[PDB]
Amino acid sequence: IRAVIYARVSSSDQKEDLERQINYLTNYATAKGYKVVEVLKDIASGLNTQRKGLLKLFKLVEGRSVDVVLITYKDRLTRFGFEYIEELFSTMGVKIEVVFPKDATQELVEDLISIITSFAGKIYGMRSHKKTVLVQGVKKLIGE
Amino acid sequence: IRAVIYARVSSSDQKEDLERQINYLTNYATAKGYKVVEVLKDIASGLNTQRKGLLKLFKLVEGRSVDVVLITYKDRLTRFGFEYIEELFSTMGVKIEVVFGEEPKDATQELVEDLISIITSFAGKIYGMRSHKKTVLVQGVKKLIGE
């Protein structure tokens, strides 16, 4: 069962934790009996739909080369719209195997802000005073 | 040539604005000369990936019946992950035609409603789906929005 490993970390500092993720899935697959075709990684947010590695994964899947995609948690593949990726892959007959995070809270808070900042711009103005009010307030509120 | 109309409104009260949507696109199409194969609608949030209409649209496109999808704004198809839907459709050789751009004007009420749900879900993920600190952040953000 030809497999493609997708691993992702948000920050550059977390570079060591990404290699551990690849390694978990690499040994996971070779114990399961999967031949690891390729290993695709990214040091970016789950929110970015234009990740270089993710778009290489899309092309790999579409090329009907691989049979299964391995990720540690759903969170790794994408923050939002997993179901759409699941649908794109399934039409190519590719299954997503989710091996399991209670760990990441800093990733959830950081992703929350970036959403609030973009939406605040859409609601009040990308260079408005009220946008700054909400984002400075929310940042202070999480501190508590 | 063969076209499918996708229209969406978040609330039941906005039922009049959904029919206006369908109409803009139905005529747009007859002017484009496109034959409108089907019209799919939904009274739900862009955040819901499991909309009955969206999933009927997915099956229609996958069946290679339709050639183009018409929407007024990207926003209508989905709040997040438009690029994934765009990719799913393109592999079936279906194009998404977005009639409008940076035109949203009333959209501020849908953006704030979606923003509250996002903060509520994330608060659960950060503090606990039934936690005290989750209630603290969501009650605070709601109060901060008023101002």
Domain shared by B11 and B66, yes or no: yes
Closest CA to B118 of B85, B145, B96: B145
Q: Which residues contact B35 (CB under 8 A, 6 or more apart)?
A: B1, B2, B3, B29
- Name the interface residues of A facing B (CB cutoff 8 Å): 49-50, 58, 62, 78-85, 87-88, 91-92, 105, 108-109, 111-112, 115-116, 119, 122-123, 133-134, 137-138, 141-142, 144
Domain shared by B75 and B110, yes or no: no
Reading the block at residue B20, the tokens are 């206006």
The Cα B52–Cα A74 span in angstroms is 23
Reading the block at residue A53, the tokens are 């590695």
Q: At what angle do helices A106-124 and A129-143 cross, to 10 degrees?
A: 160
Cβ proximity of A124 and A134 under 8 Å? yes
Reading the block at residue B134, the tokens are 């989750």
Which of B45, B88, B136 to mutate against chain A (most A CBs within 10 Å)?
B88
Burial of A133 (0-12, 13-18, 19+ CB in 10 A): middle
Reading the block at residue B95, the tokens are 């194009």
The Cα B129–Cα B122 span in angstroms is 9
Residue B85 to residues A37, A42, A71, B25, B90: CA-CA distances in angstroms? Answer: 26, 21, 21, 20, 8
Please report the resolution in angstroms: 2.9
Cβ proximity of B34 and B72 under 8 Å? no
**Which sign does the torsion angle of CA B129, B130, B135, B136 carry?**
negative
Residue A119 has its nearest CB partner, among B104, B111, B126, at B111
Report, as residue numbers or ranges, the catalytic residues of B: 10
How, if at all, do strands B68-71 and B95-98 pair? parallel
The Cα B77–Cα B75 span in angstroms is 6
Cβ proximity of B120 and B112 under 8 Å? no
Closest CA to B98 of B67, B75, B81: B75
The Cα B56–Cα B35 span in angstroms is 19
Contact B83 A50 (CB under 8 A): yes
Cβ proximity of A50 and A37 under 8 Å? no
Q: How many domains does chain A have?
A: 2
> Nearest-CA distance from B29 to chain A in Å?
26
Residue B124 to residues A37, B41, B135, B142: CA-CA distances in angstroms? Answer: 37, 31, 9, 16
The domain spanning residue B41 has which CATH number?
3.40.50.1390
What experimental approach yielded this model?
X-ray
The Cα B8–Cα B77 span in angstroms is 7
The Cα A82–Cα B80 span in angstroms is 10
Domain shared by B3 and B33, yes or no: yes
Domain shared by B142 and B126, yes or no: yes
Residue A83 to residues A86, A125, B48, B53, B60: CA-CA distances in angstroms? Answer: 5, 31, 10, 15, 17
Domain shared by A12 and A78, yes or no: yes
Domain shared by B110 and B52, yes or no: no
End-to-end, the C-alpha distance of chain B in Å comes to 49
Domain shared by A75 and A8, yes or no: yes
Q: Which residues contact B106 (CB under 8 A, 6 or more apart)?
A: none
Domain shared by A96 and A106, yes or no: no
State the DSSP string of chain A.
Answer: --EEEEEEESSSTTHHHHHHHHHHHHHHHHHHT--EEEEEEEES-TT-TT-HHHHHHHHHHHTT--SEEEESSHHHH-SS-HHHHHHHHHHTT-EEEE----S-SHHHHHHHHHHHHHHHHHHH-TT-HHHHHHHHHHHHHHH-
Domain shared by B56 and B79, yes or no: yes
Contact A80 B81 (CB under 8 A): yes
The Cα A51–Cα A44 span in angstroms is 7
Mark whether A11 is an active-site residue: no
Domain shared by B96 and B106, yes or no: no
**Beta-bridge partners for B6:** B40
Domain shared by A86 and A17, yes or no: yes
The Cα A98–Cα A29 span in angstroms is 12
Reading the block at residue A18, the tokens are 């990404």
Torsion, Cα of B98, B51, A44, B141 (10° steps) = 100
The domain spanning residue A125 has which CATH number?
1.10.287.2170
Domain shared by A106 and A140, yes or no: yes
The Cα B68–Cα B73 span in angstroms is 15
CA B8 from chain center: how many Å? 6
Strands ordered across the beta sheet of B2-9: B35-43, B2-9, B68-71, B95-98
**3-class secondary structure for chain B?**
CEEEEEEEECCCCCHHHHHHHHHHHHHHHHHHCCEEEEEEEEECCCCCCCCHHHHHHHHHHHCCCCCEEEECCHHHHCCCCHHHHHHHHHHCCCEEEECCCCCCCCCHHHHHHHHHHHHHHHHHHHHCCCCHHHHHHHHHHHHHHHC
In which domain, by residue range, is B140 found?
102-147
